[PDB]
Ligand binder design. Sequence first.
Ligand SMILES: c1cnc2c(c1)ccc1cccnc12
Length: 330
Amino acid sequence: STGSATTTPIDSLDDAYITPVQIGTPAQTLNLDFDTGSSDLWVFSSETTASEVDGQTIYTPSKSTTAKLLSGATWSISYGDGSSSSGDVYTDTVSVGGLTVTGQAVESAKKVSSSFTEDSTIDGLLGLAFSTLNTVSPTQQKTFFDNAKASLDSPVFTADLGYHAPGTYNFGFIDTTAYTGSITYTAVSTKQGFWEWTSTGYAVGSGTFKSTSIDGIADTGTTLLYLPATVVSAYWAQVSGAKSSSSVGGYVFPCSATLPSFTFGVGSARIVIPGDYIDFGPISTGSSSCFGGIQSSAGIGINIFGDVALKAAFVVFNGATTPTLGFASK
Ligand SMILES: c1cnc2c(c1)ccc1cccnc12
């Protein structure tokens, strides 16, 4: 089998991407944030504290003839951005773009933190990291991809995120028309549960490529590109007026600037992020200071190849017996 679904930026900045997902019988369609940095499929629901729901679409398990409560199971997650959610668990039928998993764990939120409530466009998350990170207790649950993998034509999914435009998540096949050149594969460590790989270096604009190993994760659920302070300083030094702002919480730059591209290495291959992809707009409404799309990872403990980087590439999440990651230009 295969599945193919369109993913759409939630806003004019590409702060996140949503993909429609069918849950239950009859289908209830929720727009979920596919997150290769986590491993829980959780949804706003009829069980979510009413004051914490503000425009999201909810899953109502009582209206699904295939929903079964997973007895005694709870979940609770906290993300790198400080947000969190928690609740109980059902199994139900979940379909993404024609691909169906019966008995998928659907984690129904009883509580969500303020940033989730404040984002009316995201109805939940669909985790695509390794199932070892799944938070369901006392019986850990598998991700959608993990449940689907054996049935797929090939044990892979691909992320083709658009810049200010829709893109695609495919399960079970590589669309050879969706990229240019070849796909370069690179090794993955699963030891921390992430799609963790090592970039071979970087360049700023037309500058010299610096060969240097950068360990990080491929994370569709993080907006920006978080890299070591030395790398980020080298990038922003090329932008007149750019500075690191403690008040704002990262590098900012004059909105009148035209930004240089940023290249990252994948083995001997190179992915070029166009400068425009690094502009995240005014720091506050009407400001002429703009927030940068490349930020320091210094206070994180890990480098994160978020959407800023991944949207510049066609990315293969290869779930073969030894997982690997593939990148192509597009
Ligand atoms: C991800 C993270 N932080 C941001 C954005 C996206 C977009 C704009 C912005 C403006 C000020 C501070 N942070 C951000």
